Amino acid sequence: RSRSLAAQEPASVLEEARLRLHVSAVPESLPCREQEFQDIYNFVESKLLDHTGGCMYISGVPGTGKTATVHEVIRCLQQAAQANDVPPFQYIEVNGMKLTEPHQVYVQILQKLTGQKATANHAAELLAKQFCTRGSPQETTVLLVDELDLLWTHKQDIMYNLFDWPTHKEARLVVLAIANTMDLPERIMMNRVSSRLGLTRMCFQPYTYSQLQQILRSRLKHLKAFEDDAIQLVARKVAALSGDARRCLDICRRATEICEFSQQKPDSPGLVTIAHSMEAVDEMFSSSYITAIKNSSVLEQSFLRAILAEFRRSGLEEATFQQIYSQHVALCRMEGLPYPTMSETMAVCSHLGSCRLLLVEPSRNDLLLRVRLNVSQDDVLYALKDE
Template sequence: PYLRALATLHVSATPDDLPCRDEEFERVLGKVEGLLEEGEGGCIYVSGVPGTGKTATVHAVVRTLHARAQASEIPPFTFLEVNGLKLTDAREAYAELWRVVSGDDMDKRVSPGEALRRLVAYFERSGRRGPEAGCFVVLMDELDQLITTKQDVVYNFFNWPTLPGSRLVVIAVANTMDLPERVMAGKVRSRLGMERINFAPYTRDQLKEIVNSRLRGGNVPPEKIMHADAIQIAAMRVAGVSGDARRILDISR
């Protein structure tokens, strides 16, 4: 049971459920599902300090949407995840999006500059495409890392969903709440009509529930692995410093 507990408490483990983020999950799910059903584009900005479950919540939303699409409850869509920490140059995001939009995974020779030109042409004429055109959901994780001096990458990914018929839904995840203000002028920002969802740091009780939920999910009775007081002390300390779920999982291991 101890090895199983170690595995289930690992930061990279995917739990069956996501405790203490039901409200945020429903908000993201409702917004993305509504856009897909209406065949519209849109942008959702998710912010919060590290370790507050932002990316995990979005992944859970996408899994739910994939299941509903497979059951023909919502239109099918293509999902792309762009992680700012994994790109050596922010403009590589253009090439990644073009590969998905064009449906050509082998088209790795397209440079970021050429991909940008093709994407601009694609989205500017997207209003004239038929209703059978594909829907795309893009998770832009670690958006803070994609900020460039010209701000063009973030601006374009925020702007394209607003174009008629784009059918592009962008879920932007960042650590800072004011990133849209820093990237875009007021007029542009108001035109985007961006849905904003902030994830507060986890409280002591929420951190305790996260540890207990992970252990129960691995079929490990929490009381047989960790003393309740140990979880309580760890939760108090982490909540007092950062409210970072990853920190309490590391401590618990």
């Protein structure tokens, strides 16, 4: 025991639920996906026994299991290599955002295999002559790349030459191209990249309604702290948004924090109530516009009121700064305040300009300021009459 607080053991129930719900403390991966994990299992298994190389490109939004399901593909092949079943392999990992320049990918590959480090040209030339070496055995390695749009250049000499490497004789490269949407090869990339690749793009669909209630059930197998009516309610809103696997457990973590705010009382409730599910939606999707007019002063709410009054008899959402100052004095004198000065016109604009709630060019044309409302013109009328 070196550290004074070497992980305090959770002696309660609510403190233990965060261990099984954490994105890092995962005993395996996200279940409810056996028809897709078995399909990619026979694909990678057929490449190691054949001593060849192929390509692989999936699809889906960043949050469907592209970072958890790919780990179990390696954990299952390493067990058979120790039992004299599949040939041994090498574990290579590389991310697309860890490198600033898109041409520095040749440094992480040479350093992972051997130990020599060069640059984008001194190393990029040695890797080209090493793959075509006649009379040298290799291993069934695996190439895992992420975020392909960052490696796109003007000459298209990053994604094209990468796919032509495993298409040789002594080439055992298994490329795992990870991206987002599936129409990338036919949009950003041109003809040469999409030609030498193949139509083997099997997209991954988000989890269904019956799958989100099962993954959360596996994490809470022996956690008697949540009712059955609150688990299906949280998994229902995320299933209708986009079905993201990351937007479901984050809302459940908020439910574990809103309940502790009521645990300060001497009474210690067991299961959650119905009030914790309603508050887990408004706080998760908070609005940064309905609270700006309620907590405003007097001159701020009167300045925004004259903007809609001038965009009614004209029909155009673009105006100047000299015209808005004329009608601003009419609304200020009726309620009971003197005429506003000219020097303070930029002071009240800098307050709304700092938060960028009114799109306008900087202080260059003070009398030609373009007024551009960040929100609509009908939502500001309902939030104003509430006071």
